[PDB]
Every structure is written in structure tokens, then in C-alpha cells.
């Protein structure tokens, strides 16, 4: 009759800030109501940035702990001490500089989408490529991106936690 409920948390009404977004029509999981207090566009931007970063980080850890190593004597360090040896070596600051450039332009994207100067969607950066033309295909692809991002966030969290606890490669 009313108060469209969260399909994930069935005892809490879905936050109206979730309407029109990818993960709302099937999950709608906002129990703490962050979207009620924070701008849902910013939250989606943060979620997708985290998901993409974690999806890169998970495969990076997989490669580094499987023996995939760049051809250099300085690069022959384990993943645990990788982000101390590479910090001292220099490339960590280099990656920081380039990601800082990319993130400054991402800041421009965010501070242009909020004022309406662009019709840019939160996670959108313009990379269509493997993007369906049909709207249903676009929605399903965005849902796949979000689910993979969340899964890899949790996966990388577990990977780093278990690797620090018990120093091993990855299957543990």
C-alpha cells in the first residue's frame, strides 16, 4: 500500500534517495540511512571509486603473490613489504602523483556534476566501449560493475587481513 520496503533489509523502508539508481530496484540496502543524510550522488561516486580501486587491488595482490613481478632487482620483495620497499624506492610517490592528477580531474567531474553543468551520472566518466546500447543492457552492466566492486572490496579486505595475519601467498 505504501512505504516501498528495502528488498535487502525487509524491516526498513527504502531510502528515497536510492530511487533511480542501479542497486535499489533489487536490493535497496541502506539500513543506516547514509543516503538520507549524505548526497546519494556523492555516495555512489565513492562506492564506485572504491569498487574499481579494490578490483584493481585484488588482482594486483593476486599477481604480486603469484610470482608476477616486474623485471627489476628492487621489485623482488613480497607483497607485505612491497609497500615499504616501493615507498623507499620511489614508485609509490610516482603512482601517487599520477593518481593525484587523475583524482584532481575526478574532483572537477564531481564539482561539475553537482552544479548541473553536466548531465554526468555519478560513476560515469565517458568510457563506453563495452557498454550495451539497450537501456536494460546498460542497467545490467552497471549492476555487474557494482556487484563485482563490492565483492572485490570485501575480497581485498580479507586478502590483506589474512596475509598480514598469516604470511602466505593467497589460497592460504
Amino acid at each position: 500500500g505504501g512505504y516501498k520496503m528495502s528488498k535487502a533489509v525487509p524491516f526498513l523502508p527504502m531510502s528515497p534517495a536510492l530511487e533511480g539508481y542501479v542497486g535499489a530496484e533489487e536490493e535497496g540496502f541502506d539500513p543506516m540511512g547514509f543516503s538520507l543524510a549524505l548526497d546519494i550522488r556523492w555516495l555512489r561516486e565513492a562506492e564506485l571509486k572504491h569498487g574499481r580501486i579494490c578490483m584493481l587491488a585484488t588482482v594486483g595482490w593476486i599477481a604480486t603473490d603469484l610470482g608476477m613481478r616486474l623485471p627489476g632487482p628492487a621489485y623482488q620483495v613480497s607483497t607485505l613489504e612491497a609497500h615499504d620497499a616501493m615507498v623507499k624506492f620511489g614508485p609509490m610517490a610516482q603512482i601517487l602523483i599520477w593518481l593525484g592528477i587523475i583524482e584532481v580531474f575526478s574532483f572537477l567531474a564531481i564539482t561539475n556534476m553537482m552544479e548541473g553543468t553536466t548531465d554526468r551520472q555519478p560513476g560515469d566518466y565517458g568510457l563506453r566501449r563495452l557498454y550495451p546500447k539497450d537501456e536494460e543492457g546498460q542497467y545490467e552492466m552497471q549492476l555487474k560493475e557494482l556487484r563485482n566492486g563490492r565483492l572485490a572490496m570485501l575480497a581485498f579486505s580479507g586478502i590483506v587481513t589474512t596475509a598480514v595475519l598469516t604470511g602466505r601467498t593467497w589460497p592460504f
Binding site: 538520507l36 543524510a37 552544479e115
Partner: peptide, 13 residues
Amino acid sequence: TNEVSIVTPPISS
């Protein structure tokens, strides 16, 4: 009320 009340400053670029 299931309403959206964003607690963040409405700042402008």
C-alpha cells in the same frame, strides 16, 4: 517521515 535531509553544507563552487 521517510524523507531525505542531507546534512552537508549547501556550498557552491
